[PDB]
Design a protein around this ligand. Structure first.
Ligand SMILES: Cc1cc(=O)oc2cc(O[C@@H]3O[C@H](CO)[C@H](O)[C@H](O)[C@H]3O)ccc12
Lengths: 133, 16, 15, 133, 15, 133, 133, 16
């Protein structure tokens, strides 16, 4: 797939993603906060299309992500991120995608997700998160 | 916390 | 170096 | 004067400032790094003209500031920043302005300057620096 | 306040 | 379980734990680094005995943990940490305890684990980790 | 001088220093906070004695240092820290010593002093501060 | 990359 790396920002305003209920997560794009102004991140797109788009618009700055969870599994012989869920201090968003395979979860007691990196082919292959105070 | 990341800040130097 | 660094956790998924 | 606050970034690529050899620092503008891309900071302009411009172009990322120092003092009845000097791991830029009044200095043993804020009227009135690892 | 802060991830397990 | 919270330190020198394949992780104790000296954390003991002890003595500071993983699961009607694995830049320690239940993992691309907190009853109920640069 | 380096802690509970109003700062010892508990730092002592001791007992955690300032000057052929003042969010402690020579100051807009290093011979030669969020 | 946590350090002040 195509590796991406947004780097680190001061916060998250909006998450745009896409998914298919029979395969996996496809596209991913974040609207970051940068020093109190919105910064529209690169749109990281699947090599294919036909996904269902989702916009998660957070009530920034009071609302923030406290846990990212999901499932990784096999789609056409590739290990990919099949589903994501985003839990904030106020609401849960998801699950989006297919909830089967190996679960993973990153709960945060203190600190913030401030950036994402990863790789996307037909589907989101893998991802990592920048964390800060 | 709030959703805004924090940084160490030193200063000001100059006028009070 | 002159590049600020940040904690990074992951990856989750392939590889 | 007029307050400014660039916020915090990944590093510093260039500082563009103006000064007068009989008065103080005038204009101040910074090209930051933001996750590997230059981020062109707003030009924070003095209310007055007559300054000499200087462009401090750093060999980012191998070159970074290790000490900022200067003088603060009276100009026309105002306490302003009269002089600045920027010392990097590779060389010294300045003094710019007038080396008179009360000295100040911020040496860094570990960490980086990632942002500036302050206020500029006729001259740079005061400033602060964001620091990060 | 006067107490330094750190990123904390977790908990994993119960509750 | 009884809550514990070691707080944050400079790094990790040694992890002392105990486990039983039939059940879960029991005791947990960490020797931290504190500014280049060993800091002997409190031994957080299980309420019961019968565990196999494990001492993970790291080559500090050359060797450091790059991934913590394990499994949570029901033992005698309680959700607990049944298994832990510590992967460093040098080698892998574990799994200690059966790898059955809900997996979790915290790989670290950049940064360090500097502290643990959690709760231990008969078994390790839950835990969190302090992370720093 | 003998170099010292306390490293970094959670915050500051007490500063013990000594000075002579004819010479300079003599001894320096800090009681840190380490994860909510007091940690008694190494006592950094001058090669000579005769100084007047002072104890700055902070109302930790509500009271914290916002600015450190002082003067460096020549005493009997040695360039040393002749004077220190600690300003907290509650009050000013000092100046202790002789307010003569070149001034320095470290004002903090955001963050905490969490550690000291430096060198002491006959007098406090120099010092640096660890800063954290 | 080492197993030692790092922190911002400012200074020195005094004799350098
Ligand atoms: C009935 C029973 C059976 C058994 O095998 O173990 C326990 C343990 C009990 O104490 C609990 O320890 C757990 C798990 O670590 C929780 O921390 C819980 O809060 C403790 O009370 C109680 C009954 C049994």
């Amino acid at each position: 797939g195509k590796a991406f790396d947004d780097g680190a920002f001061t916060g998250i305003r909006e998450i745009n993603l896409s998914y298919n209920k029979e395969t996996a997560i496809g596209d991913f794009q974040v609207v970051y906060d940068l020093n109190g102004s919105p910064y529209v991140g690169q749109n990281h797109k699947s090599f294919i299309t036909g996904f269902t788009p989702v916009k998660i618009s957070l009530d920034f700055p009071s609302e923030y992500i406290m846990e990212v969870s999901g499932y990784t599994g096999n789609v056409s012989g590739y290990v990919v991120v099949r589903s994501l869920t985003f839990k904030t201090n106020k609401k849960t968003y998801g699950p989006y995608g297919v909830t089967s395979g190996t679960p993973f979860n990153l709960p945060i007691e203190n600190g913030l997700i401030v950036g994402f990196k990863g790789s996307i082919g037909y589907w989101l292959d893998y991802f990592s998160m920048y964390l800060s105070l | 916390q709030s959703g805004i990341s924090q940084t160490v800040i030193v200063g000001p130097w100059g006028a009070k």
